[PDB]
């Protein structure tokens, strides 16, 4: 929960940030989004983190209405920082869910072919991270959940770079690698538990570990 004033202070930051986004003042967007983040740290609660993510989303949505791409980058940047600072699977799902919406916001304003490609590609990264999370929770093993979280972090950052520079092919290929690796880890996890013969299970386990290192190398 949040003290009734904490909810008020965030809405104050929200309006100030939204205004800066509307007026295209990015440095003020950057500062206000910082304040929203620091509230989330001080509070340290899941519900506060979700509120900060909402502020970042509203900032991106408003900047997209006015064609201010830079303010969108600031929203995406803070979302990934919230995600990378988190250690629970709910924040990561929320974070990647917002990055999808931000990528859509980029499309509305930019409206370029690259933006269209980036949007389609971030929601596949969100879909892969979600599946990996759900599968890890089905195992009940915390260390497998730690892994799903780690991969969702990698997917989030790599989705930010796409948002920042959708034209760059290096950036775009980097996420393609991550998404594939995540999908490979999910299948391997399923096979490591479901497979009929022991040889395939062992190979699946070695496969999980191999897919993680690859995404880390990207």
């Amino acid at each position: 929960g949040t003290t009734e004033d904490e909810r008020r202070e965030l809405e104050k930051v929200a309006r100030k940030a939204i205004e800066a986004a509307r007026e295209g003042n990015t440095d003020e967007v950057r500062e206000q989004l910082q304040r929203a983040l620091e509230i989330a740290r001080e509070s340290g609660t899941k519900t506060a983190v979700k509120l900060a993510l909402d502020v970042a989303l509203r900032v991106a949505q408003e900047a997209a209405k006015r064609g201010n791409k830079d303010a969108i980058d600031e929203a995406a940047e803070v979302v990934v920082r919230i995600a990378e600072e988190s250690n629970n699977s709910d924040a990561l799902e929320q974070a990647l869910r917002v990055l999808e919406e931000i990528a859509k916001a980029v499309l509305k304003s930019e409206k370029t072919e690259d933006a269209k490609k980036a949007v389609k590609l971030v929601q596949e990264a969100y879909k892969a991270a979600q599946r990996a999370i759900e599968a890890a929770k089905r195992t009940g093993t915390p260390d497998v959940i730690k892994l799903a979280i780690k991969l969702a972090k990698l997917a989030a950052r790599a989705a930010l770079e796409v948002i920042k520079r959708p034209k760059s092919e290096e950036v775009n290929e980097a996420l393609k690698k991550i998404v594939k690796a995540i999908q490979e880890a999910v299948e391997s996890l399923r096979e490591a538990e479901e497979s009929g013969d022991p040889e395939k299970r062992e190979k699946a386990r070695e496969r999980v570990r191999e897919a993680v290192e690859r995404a880390e190398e990207v």
Side-chain angles (χ1 to χ4, degrees), residues 1 3 10 13-14 17-18 20-21 24-29 32-34 36-41 43-49 52-64 67-107 109 112-116 118-119 121-126 128-129 132-133 135-145 147-149 151-162 164 166 168-175 178-179 181-183 185-186 188-189 191-198 201 204-205 207-208 211-212 215 218:
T3 304
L10 270 155
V13 169
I18 288 176
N25 185 6
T26 68
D27 302 15
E28 195 68 29
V29 162
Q32 298 304 130
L33 296 180
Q34 226 87 231
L37 172 55
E38 304 209 69
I39 291 176
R41 280 111 170 262
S43 179
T45 71
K46 288 174 101 202
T47 173
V49 158
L53 290 168
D54 288 4
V55 173
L57 181 50
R58 297 204 285 271
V59 161
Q61 291 174 329
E62 192 67 31
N68 287 323
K69 143 82 174 188
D70 288 329
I72 295 169
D73 290 5
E74 301 297 323
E77 189 77 49
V78 171
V79 169
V80 159
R81 220 146 71 203
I82 281 168
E84 288 179 322
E85 265 174 78
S86 312
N87 291 115
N88 76 91
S89 73
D90 283 332
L92 270 290
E93 276 175 24
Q94 289 157 1
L96 292 168
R97 171 63 196 174
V98 170
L99 287 181
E100 171 183 40
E101 296 294 286
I102 290 183
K104 298 164 135 172
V106 175
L107 185 63
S109 54
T112 62
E113 295 299 286
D114 288 335
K116 296 179 177 183
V119 175
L121 165 57
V122 300
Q123 51 203 139
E124 278 298 316
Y126 169 64
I133 280 156
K137 296 207 251 174
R138 284 201 297 264
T139 65
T141 308
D143 283 347
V144 179
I145 303 171
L147 191 68
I149 287 163
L151 290 172
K153 288 163 140 82
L154 297 165
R157 169 122 293 179
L160 170 65
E161 292 300 335
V162 158
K164 281 188 189 162
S168 182
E169 285 290 59
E170 308 145 24
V171 159
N172 197 307
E173 241 300 333
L175 196 68
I178 291 166
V179 179
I182 292 168
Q183 274 155 328
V186 177
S188 300
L189 269 166
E191 215 187 333
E193 170 58 38
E194 295 208 43
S195 182
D197 71 332
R201 291 200 306 245
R205 303 186 179 110
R207 233 145 53 205
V208 172
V212 185
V218 167

